[PDB]
Design an enzyme around this catalytic site. Structure first.
Site, PDB file in Angstrom:
ATOM      1  N   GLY A  21       0.770  -1.238   0.000  1.00  0.00           N
ATOM      2  CA  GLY A  21       0.000   0.000   0.000  1.00  0.00           C
ATOM      3  C   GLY A  21       0.803   1.291   0.000  1.00  0.00           C
ATOM      4  O   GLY A  21       0.234   2.346  -0.285  1.00  0.00           O
ATOM      5  N   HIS A 135      12.998  15.942   0.799  1.00  0.00           N
ATOM      6  CA  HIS A 135      12.560  16.194   2.206  1.00  0.00           C
ATOM      7  C   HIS A 135      13.535  15.761   3.282  1.00  0.00           C
ATOM      8  O   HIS A 135      13.330  16.135   4.430  1.00  0.00           O
ATOM      9  CB  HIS A 135      11.237  15.470   2.512  1.00  0.00           C
ATOM     10  CG  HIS A 135      10.106  15.841   1.625  1.00  0.00           C
ATOM     11  ND1 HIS A 135       9.596  17.116   1.615  1.00  0.00           N
ATOM     12  CD2 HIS A 135       9.394  15.071   0.780  1.00  0.00           C
ATOM     13  CE1 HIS A 135       8.610  17.095   0.734  1.00  0.00           C
ATOM     14  NE2 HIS A 135       8.443  15.870   0.229  1.00  0.00           N
ATOM     15  N   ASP A 168      12.458  23.314  -8.002  1.00  0.00           N
ATOM     16  CA  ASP A 168      11.707  22.147  -7.585  1.00  0.00           C
ATOM     17  C   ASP A 168      10.275  22.217  -8.108  1.00  0.00           C
ATOM     18  O   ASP A 168       9.512  23.071  -7.648  1.00  0.00           O
ATOM     19  CB  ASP A 168      11.752  22.155  -6.071  1.00  0.00           C
ATOM     20  CG  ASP A 168      11.219  20.942  -5.364  1.00  0.00           C
ATOM     21  OD1 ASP A 168      10.137  20.462  -5.745  1.00  0.00           O
ATOM     22  OD2 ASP A 168      11.883  20.478  -4.422  1.00  0.00           O
ATOM     23  N   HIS A 172       5.137  18.859  -3.907  1.00  0.00           N
ATOM     24  CA  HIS A 172       5.453  19.147  -2.514  1.00  0.00           C
ATOM     25  C   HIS A 172       6.564  20.149  -2.395  1.00  0.00           C
ATOM     26  O   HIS A 172       7.460  20.169  -3.231  1.00  0.00           O
ATOM     27  CB  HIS A 172       5.830  17.852  -1.750  1.00  0.00           C
ATOM     28  CG  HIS A 172       4.736  16.822  -1.725  1.00  0.00           C
ATOM     29  ND1 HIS A 172       4.668  15.827  -2.681  1.00  0.00           N
ATOM     30  CD2 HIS A 172       3.689  16.684  -0.869  1.00  0.00           C
ATOM     31  CE1 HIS A 172       3.594  15.108  -2.387  1.00  0.00           C
ATOM     32  NE2 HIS A 172       2.963  15.594  -1.298  1.00  0.00           N
ATOM     33  N   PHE A 181      20.153  25.101   2.834  1.00  0.00           N
ATOM     34  CA  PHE A 181      20.771  26.310   2.286  1.00  0.00           C
ATOM     35  C   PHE A 181      20.102  27.629   2.689  1.00  0.00           C
ATOM     36  O   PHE A 181      20.346  28.673   2.059  1.00  0.00           O
ATOM     37  CB  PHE A 181      20.853  26.182   0.758  1.00  0.00           C
ATOM     38  CG  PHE A 181      21.668  24.964   0.361  1.00  0.00           C
ATOM     39  CD1 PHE A 181      23.015  24.857   0.722  1.00  0.00           C
ATOM     40  CD2 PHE A 181      21.081  23.909  -0.335  1.00  0.00           C
ATOM     41  CE1 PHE A 181      23.767  23.730   0.359  1.00  0.00           C
ATOM     42  CE2 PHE A 181      21.833  22.787  -0.696  1.00  0.00           C
ATOM     43  CZ  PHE A 181      23.168  22.695  -0.330  1.00  0.00           C
ATOM     44  N   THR A 184      22.404  30.743   3.337  1.00  0.00           N
ATOM     45  CA  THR A 184      23.451  31.045   2.373  1.00  0.00           C
ATOM     46  C   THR A 184      22.886  31.619   1.088  1.00  0.00           C
ATOM     47  O   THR A 184      21.762  31.275   0.667  1.00  0.00           O
ATOM     48  CB  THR A 184      24.403  29.849   2.129  1.00  0.00           C
ATOM     49  OG1 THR A 184      25.502  30.302   1.328  1.00  0.00           O
ATOM     50  CG2 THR A 184      23.720  28.653   1.428  1.00  0.00           C
ATOM     51  N   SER A 191      10.956  26.888  -5.193  1.00  0.00           N
ATOM     52  CA  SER A 191      10.015  25.778  -5.164  1.00  0.00           C
ATOM     53  C   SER A 191       8.612  26.232  -5.529  1.00  0.00           C
ATOM     54  O   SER A 191       8.149  27.256  -5.029  1.00  0.00           O
ATOM     55  CB  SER A 191      10.028  25.093  -3.797  1.00  0.00           C
ATOM     56  OG  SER A 191       9.093  24.023  -3.760  1.00  0.00           O
ATOM     57  N   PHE A 192       7.937  25.457  -6.404  1.00  0.00           N
ATOM     58  CA  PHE A 192       6.542  25.698  -6.819  1.00  0.00           C
ATOM     59  C   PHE A 192       5.841  24.509  -6.183  1.00  0.00           C
ATOM     60  O   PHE A 192       6.313  23.390  -6.331  1.00  0.00           O
ATOM     61  CB  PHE A 192       6.397  25.631  -8.350  1.00  0.00           C
ATOM     62  CG  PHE A 192       7.237  26.665  -9.057  1.00  0.00           C
ATOM     63  CD1 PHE A 192       8.578  26.419  -9.344  1.00  0.00           C
ATOM     64  CD2 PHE A 192       6.691  27.889  -9.438  1.00  0.00           C
ATOM     65  CE1 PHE A 192       9.354  27.382  -9.989  1.00  0.00           C
ATOM     66  CE2 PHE A 192       7.482  28.860 -10.055  1.00  0.00           C
ATOM     67  CZ  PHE A 192       8.804  28.600 -10.320  1.00  0.00           C
ATOM     68  N   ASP A 258       4.618  14.124  -9.442  1.00  0.00           N
ATOM     69  CA  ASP A 258       3.343  14.105  -8.705  1.00  0.00           C
ATOM     70  C   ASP A 258       2.533  15.399  -8.950  1.00  0.00           C
ATOM     71  O   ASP A 258       1.440  15.572  -8.412  1.00  0.00           O
ATOM     72  CB  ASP A 258       3.542  13.767  -7.207  1.00  0.00           C
ATOM     73  CG  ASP A 258       4.609  14.595  -6.518  1.00  0.00           C
ATOM     74  OD1 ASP A 258       5.106  15.583  -7.150  1.00  0.00           O
ATOM     75  OD2 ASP A 258       4.925  14.296  -5.335  1.00  0.00           O
TER      76      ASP A 258
HETATM   77  C1  LIG Z   1       0.437   5.673   6.708  1.00  0.00           C
HETATM   78  C2  LIG Z   1       1.579   6.669   6.976  1.00  0.00           C
HETATM   79  C3  LIG Z   1       1.209   8.043   7.637  1.00  0.00           C
HETATM   80  C4  LIG Z   1       0.722   7.895   9.093  1.00  0.00           C
HETATM   81  C5  LIG Z   1       0.234   8.817   6.682  1.00  0.00           C
HETATM   82  N1  LIG Z   1       0.806   9.142   5.331  1.00  0.00           N
HETATM   83  C6  LIG Z   1       0.104   9.085   4.142  1.00  0.00           C
HETATM   84  O1  LIG Z   1      -1.109   9.011   4.063  1.00  0.00           O
HETATM   85  C7  LIG Z   1       0.942   9.105   2.843  1.00  0.00           C
HETATM   86  C8  LIG Z   1       1.663   7.746   2.591  1.00  0.00           C
HETATM   87  C9  LIG Z   1       0.752   6.562   2.553  1.00  0.00           C
HETATM   88  C10 LIG Z   1      -0.543   6.506   2.016  1.00  0.00           C
HETATM   89  N2  LIG Z   1      -0.985   5.144   2.148  1.00  0.00           N
HETATM   90  O2  LIG Z   1      -2.201   4.579   1.827  1.00  0.00           O
HETATM   91  C11 LIG Z   1      -3.225   5.391   1.238  1.00  0.00           C
HETATM   92  C12 LIG Z   1       0.014   4.358   2.760  1.00  0.00           C
HETATM   93  C13 LIG Z   1       0.005   2.981   3.049  1.00  0.00           C
HETATM   94  C14 LIG Z   1       1.156   2.488   3.665  1.00  0.00           C
HETATM   95  C15 LIG Z   1       2.262   3.342   3.980  1.00  0.00           C
HETATM   96  C16 LIG Z   1       2.242   4.712   3.671  1.00  0.00           C
HETATM   97  C17 LIG Z   1       1.107   5.225   3.044  1.00  0.00           C
HETATM   98  N3  LIG Z   1       1.944  10.171   3.015  1.00  0.00           N
HETATM   99  C18 LIG Z   1       1.806  11.493   2.565  1.00  0.00           C
HETATM  100  O3  LIG Z   1       1.036  11.793   1.658  1.00  0.00           O
HETATM  101  C19 LIG Z   1       2.741  12.529   3.237  1.00  0.00           C
HETATM  102  C20 LIG Z   1       4.176  12.354   2.671  1.00  0.00           C
HETATM  103  C21 LIG Z   1       4.249  12.793   1.217  1.00  0.00           C
HETATM  104  C22 LIG Z   1       5.712  12.621   0.770  1.00  0.00           C
HETATM  105  C23 LIG Z   1       5.894  13.039  -0.655  1.00  0.00           C
HETATM  106  C24 LIG Z   1       7.377  12.874  -1.109  1.00  0.00           C
HETATM  107  C25 LIG Z   1       7.780  13.718  -2.402  1.00  0.00           C
HETATM  108  O4  LIG Z   1       7.626  15.099  -2.210  1.00  0.00           O
HETATM  109  O5  LIG Z   1       6.871  13.500  -3.396  1.00  0.00           O
HETATM  110  C26 LIG Z   1       9.260  13.427  -2.925  1.00  0.00           C
HETATM  111  C27 LIG Z   1       9.699  11.964  -3.057  1.00  0.00           C
HETATM  112  N4  LIG Z   1       2.840  12.248   4.691  1.00  0.00           N
HETATM  113  C28 LIG Z   1       1.692  12.109   5.468  1.00  0.00           C
HETATM  114  O6  LIG Z   1       0.614  12.383   4.965  1.00  0.00           O
HETATM  115  C29 LIG Z   1       1.839  11.540   6.940  1.00  0.00           C
HETATM  116  C30 LIG Z   1       2.784  12.399   7.849  1.00  0.00           C
HETATM  117  C31 LIG Z   1       2.122  13.690   8.337  1.00  0.00           C
HETATM  118  C32 LIG Z   1       0.752  13.409   9.011  1.00  0.00           C
HETATM  119  C33 LIG Z   1      -0.239  12.621   8.081  1.00  0.00           C
HETATM  120  N5  LIG Z   1       0.400  11.377   7.425  1.00  0.00           N
HETATM  121  C34 LIG Z   1      -0.352  10.170   7.239  1.00  0.00           C
HETATM  122  O7  LIG Z   1      -1.538  10.148   7.543  1.00  0.00           O
HETATM  123 CA   LIG Z   2       8.085  21.802  -5.413  1.00  0.00          CA
HETATM  124 CA   LIG Z   3      19.447  29.901   0.035  1.00  0.00          CA
HETATM  125 ZN   LIG Z   4       6.061  15.117  -4.065  1.00  0.00          ZN
END
Ligand SMILES: CC[C@H](C)[C@@H]1NC(=O)[C@H](Cc2cn(OC)c3ccccc23)NC(=O)[C@H](CCCCCC(O)(O)CC)NC(=O)[C@H]2CCCCN2C1=O
Ligand SMILES: [Ca+2]
Ligand SMILES: [Ca+2]
Ligand SMILES: [Zn+2]
EC number: 3.5.1.98
Length: 367
Positions: A21, A135, A168, A172, A181, A184, A191-192, A258
Site C-alpha cells: 500500500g 525532504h 523544484d 510538494h 541552504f 546562504t 520551489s513551486f 506528482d
Molecule cells: C500511513 C503513513 C502516515 C501515518 C500517513 N501518510 C500518508 O497518508 C501518505 C503515505 C501513505 C498513504 N498510504 O495509503 C493510502 C500508505 C500505506 C502504507 C504506507 C504509507 C502510506 N503520506 C503522505 O502523503 C505525506 C508524505 C508525502 C511525501 C511526498 C514525497 C515527495 O515530495 O513526493 C518526494 C519523493 N505524509 C503524510 O501524509 C503523513 C505524515 C504527516 C501526518 C499525516 N500522514 C499520514 O496520515
Molecule cells: Ca516543489
Molecule cells: Ca538559500
Molecule cells: Zn512530491
C-alpha cells in the site's frame, strides 16, 4: 545547440519495496528506463551505473549518528531500535525495508556522480531519475526521503560553482533542500508547490531565507487544479527573473512527477507536455544542469513524464504511439505517451497567479 547527456541508472533500483500500500514505488524508475530504451534513446546518451555512495559521502551533510542508524536498521532488528526509529522519523511514512541503506546509496550515488561529471565539464546535462529526495533532513528522514541526494549533489557543485540555482517542480515543497541552504546566498532555492493543509506544511511565500540567505529562498504556493497554461505563464517569467538577478553557473532541477493530473497523492492538473515545458525553459539558459526525479505516485504517468523529459533533454522528438515494452499493459487503454488533463477546477485564478508572481518579483529586486 544539442547537449551531451549522461544518464544514471542501476538495474537493481526497481526491486526495492516500501511495503504493501505504500505509494512510493521504485519500480517506476525501471518502467521509465525500459520505456526510454524501447524508444531508442540509449543511442543518444551515455548510460552509467552509479556507484553506491559511502557513509563518508553522506556525512558531507547528514549527521554521523543518523547515517550510522540508516546503515544498521533492518526489518529483523527494528524491535531493538524503537527509540532510534522515533528520533530519526523512520516508521510508517519512511518505513524500514530490506536493502533500505543500499537504496539510499544508489539514489545518492547517481546525483553525486552526475554533479562530479558536470564539475569536470564532461557533460552538459546529467540525469538521475532515482534522485530528487528533497525532504530528508540533516538527522531525520521525511516524506519517503532518507538521504538528501540533492543537498549532497549541490555541495559537490559548490566546489566549482560560486552560485547554484535549485528549482523544484514536485507538487510538494522542497523543504529539506531549502532548510540546508536557508542561510546562504551560494544556493538559491525556488520551489513551486501545493500549499495549504498539505505535506510538509512549509513553503509559504513569506519564507524568503535568513541572514546571508535572505532573498535566496523563493516559494510559489499554489492551490488545487493548476493546469499547463497557468503553470507555463508563471514558470518562464519567474525563472527568467531568477536567472537575470542571481546569475547561477549551475542548475539542479527536481522533476517530481506528482504535479501531473491523476497523481495518487497530488491534486494538480498538468499534462506531460506542461510539466516538460519546465525542462525546456531551464535548458534554454545553456547552463550545466542536473535533472533529478522525486515524487510521482500514478506510475504509468511517471514513466511517461520522465521518458519524455529525457527526450526533451536530448532534443529528440519521440512518437506519441508507445513502442512495445516490458510494461506495455500498464499504459492502457490508450498506449500513448501523452496524457489529457482532467475536468477538475483550477482553484488558482489568473489574478492569484499574477499577484504571487508580482510579490516574488518584489523580493527578487532585493538581490
Ligand atoms: C500511513 C503513513 C502516515 C501515518 C500517513 N501518510 C500518508 O497518508 C501518505 C503515505 C501513505 C498513504 N498510504 O495509503 C493510502 C500508505 C500505506 C502504507 C504506507 C504509507 C502510506 N503520506 C503522505 O502523503 C505525506 C508524505 C508525502 C511525501 C511526498 C514525497 C515527495 O515530495 O513526493 C518526494 C519523493 N505524509 C503524510 O501524509 C503523513 C505524515 C504527516 C501526518 C499525516 N500522514 C499520514 O496520515
Ligand atoms: Ca516543489
Ligand atoms: Ca538559500
Ligand atoms: Zn512530491
Amino acid at each position: 545547440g544539442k547537449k551531451k547527456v549522461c544518464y544514471y541508472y542501476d538495474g537493481d533500483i526497481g526491486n526495492y519495496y516500501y511495503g504493501q500500500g505504500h505509494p512510493m514505488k521504485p519500480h517506476r524508475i525501471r518502467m521509465t528506463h525500459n520505456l526510454l530504451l524501447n524508444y531508442g534513446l540509449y543511442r543518444k546518451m551515455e548510460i552509467y551505473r552509479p556507484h553506491k555512495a559511502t557513509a563518508e559521502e553522506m556525512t558531507k551533510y547528514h549527521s554521523d549518528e543518523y547515517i550510522k542508524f540508516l546503515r544498521s536498521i533492518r526489518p529483523d532488528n527494528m524491535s531493538e531500535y524503537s527509540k532510534q526509529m522515533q528520533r530519526f522519523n523512520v516508521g510508517e511514512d519512511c518505513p524500514v525495508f530490506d536493502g533500505l541503506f543500499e537504496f539510499c546509496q544508489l539514489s545518492t550515488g547517481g546525483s553525486v556522480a552526475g554533479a562530479v561529471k558536470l564539475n569536470r565539464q564532461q557533460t552538459d546535462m546529467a540525469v538521475n531519475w532515482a534522485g530528487g529526495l528533497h525532504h530528508a533532513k540533516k538527522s531525520e528522514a521525511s516524506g519517503f526521503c532518507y538521504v538528501n541526494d540533492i543537498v549532497l549533489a549541490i555541495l559537490e557543485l559548490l566546489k566549482y560553482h560560486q552560485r547554484v540555482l535549485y528549482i523544484d517542480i514536485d507538487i510538494h515543497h522542497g523543504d529539506g533542500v531549502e532548510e540546508a541552504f536557508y542561510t546562504t546566498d551560494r544556493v538559491m532555492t525556488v520551489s513551486f508547490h501545493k500549499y495549504g493543509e498539505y505535506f510538509p506544511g512549509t513553503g509559504d511565500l513569506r519564507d524568503i531565507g535568513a541572514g546571508k540567505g535572505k532573498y535566496y529562498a523563493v516559494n510559489f504556493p499554489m492551490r488545487d487544479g493548476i493546469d499547463d497554461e497557468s503553470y507555463g505563464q508563471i514558470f518562464k517569467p519567474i525563472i527568467s527573473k531568477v536567472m537575470e538577478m542571481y546569475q547561477p553557473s549551475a542548475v539542479v532541477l527536481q522533476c517530481g512527477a506528482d504535479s501531473l493530473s491523476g497523481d495518487r497523492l497530488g491534486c494538480f492538473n498538468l499534462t506531460v507536455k506542461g510539466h516538460a515545458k519546465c525542462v525546456e525553459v531551464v535548458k534554454t539558459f545553456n547552463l550545466p544542469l542536473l535533472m533529478l526525479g522525486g515524487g510521482g505516485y500514478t506510475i504509468r504517468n511517471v514513466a511517461r513524464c520522465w521518458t519524455y523529459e529525457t527526450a526533451v533533454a536530448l532534443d529528440c522528438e519521440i512518437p506519441n504511439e508507445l513502442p512495445y515494452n516490458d510494461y506495455f499493459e500498464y499504459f492502457g487503454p490508450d498506449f500513448k505517451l501523452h496524457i489529457s488533463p482532467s475536468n477538475m477546477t483550477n482553484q488558482n485564478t489568473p489574478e492569484y497567479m499574477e499577484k504571487i508572481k508580482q510579490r516574488l518579483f518584489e523580493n527578487l529586486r532585493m538581490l
